[PDB]
């Protein structure tokens, strides 16, 4: 099975930007082959075909070029829609099979987050469980160092980070740091804490509540 | 032009048999091109699996061969994929697609689960803002997804309308179960004001919850 070489693995281009996405054959494929976008968590779309085809409603900032083992996609006077994955497949000979992917960002200048904090709901306490959970949004690079905190005792137990890929709106990342514990433990505390550390701060980021409260 | 519309059970057991259904409507599958099967595994990789061309004609990837099978149907005008003997390995979100002047068009895809693990169905809960922190310009609410399987849920925030400043984070995974939440941020003349609800499905279960976010006590 012939493997498609695709390069580079993710890029940062600014706006306006213009990339070229080499994919380079095994073999000699004789321009059997197609470019696909997948834009977040939906469907692709083939944006060439037989190596150097526009596809039908492809706007013409997209084009691509090749012969025999080596192809490349280049879009020009790129948008924040531009900024998603990119995968070529070659269907000469069989089976087919796709190259490896090329994610693309915007390049963006750094961001502290906007921190939120969130006790448990009155309906999850009731249901036996509590989570308190915390939002850190829109910033940049996505490297973030969070931080939990109950009555001061720092807290590695009962959390979970999620992060999301980069908003094309607004170039920035968000992550999502949950703590789950029991309600009689959470009925048990008083402070609650949540320190997000960026390479943009000197000193974290603190939200915190009291229970009491 | 044509749709491509691939409907199927979403949750397998292992050993058991992966069976799919991809709907052509807009064009005759005996007409032309040929029909597909590809998956995509988390971290996007993508598999191609096989196809069916407009004159029945098979052909598989060989990594699949003893276990592929891709027939049709041309009075309804539909393809199926049929997968044998899956193993937790064969997850992976399920696409048909046209071939031949490249891959033209696409069908919205299909998260294919392959466990022994129980459907549960998600219990939703409203995240406030902080207790008496009363804000100004801006006001962050929240929305969290507990308990629930296998992959697949929608969180919309009432409908669609609060869709710009909406941030909902991929879900993880702990224990056979899937916890995820978003985050909404609006103005404030807009809340309390307007009924802002967290609007979730859940097709395994049909468990289409709305929650109010309303403040505490």
């Known amino acids: 099975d012939i493997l498609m070489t695709q390069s580079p693995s993710s890029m940062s281009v600014s706006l306006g930007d213009t990339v070229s996405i080499t994919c380079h054959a095994s073999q000699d494929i004789i321009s059997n082959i197609g470019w696909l976008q997948q834009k977040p968590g939906k469907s692709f779309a083939g944006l060439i075909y037989?190596?150097?085809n526009l596809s039908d409603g492809v706007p013409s900032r997209f084009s691509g070029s090749g012969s025999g083992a080596d192809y490349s996609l280049t879009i020009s006077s790129l948008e924040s829609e531009d900024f998603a994955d990119y995968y070529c497949?070659?269907?000469?000979?069989?089976?087919?099979?796709f190259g490896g992917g090329t994610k693309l960002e915007i390049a963006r200048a750094d961001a502290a987050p906007t921190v939120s904090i969130f006790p448990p709901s009155s309906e999850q306490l009731t249901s036996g469980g509590a989570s308190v959970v915390c939002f850190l949004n829109n910033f940049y690079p996505k490297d973030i160092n969070v931080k939990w905190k109950i009555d001061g005792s720092e807290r590695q137990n009962g959390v979970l980070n999620s992060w999301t890929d980069q908003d094309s709106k607004d170039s920035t990342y968000s992550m999502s740091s949950t703590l789950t514990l029991t309600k009689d433990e959470y009925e048990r505390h008083n402070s609650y804490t949540c320190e997000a550390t960026h390479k943009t701060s000197t000193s974290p980021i603190v939200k915190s509540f009291n229970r009491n409260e | 032009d044509v749709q491509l519309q691939e409907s199927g059970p979403s949750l397998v057991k292992p050993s058991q048999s992966l069976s799919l259904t991809c709907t052509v409507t807009g064009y005759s599958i005996t007409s032309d091109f040929a029909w597909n099967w590809i998956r995509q595994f988390p971290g996007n990789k993508l598999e191609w699996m096989g196809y069916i061309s407009y004159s029945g004609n098979t052909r598989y990837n060989p990594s699949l061969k003893s276990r592929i099978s891709i027939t049709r149907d041309t009075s309804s005008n539909q393809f199926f994929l049929q997968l044998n003997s899956v193993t937790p390995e064969d997850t992976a979100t399920y696409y048909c697609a046209t071939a031949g002047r490249g891959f033209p068009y696409w069908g919205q895809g299909t998260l294919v689960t392959v466990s022994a693990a129980k459907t549960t169905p998600p219990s939703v809960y409203p995240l406030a803002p902080g207790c008496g922190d009363t804000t100004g310009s801006s006001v962050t609410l929240g929305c969290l997804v507990k308990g629930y399987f296998p992959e697949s849920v929608t969180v919309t925030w009432n409908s669609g309308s609060l869709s710009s400043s909406v941030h909902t984070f991929p879900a993880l995974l702990q224990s056979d179960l899937y916890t995820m939440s978003s985050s909404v941020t609006v103005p404030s003349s807009t809340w309390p004001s307007e009924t802002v609800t967290c609007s979730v499905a859940h097709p395994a279960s049909s468990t289409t919850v709305d929650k109010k976010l309303e403040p505490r006590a």
């Open positions: 037989h190596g150097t």
């Open positions: 497949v070659q269907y000469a000979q069989f089976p087919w099979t």
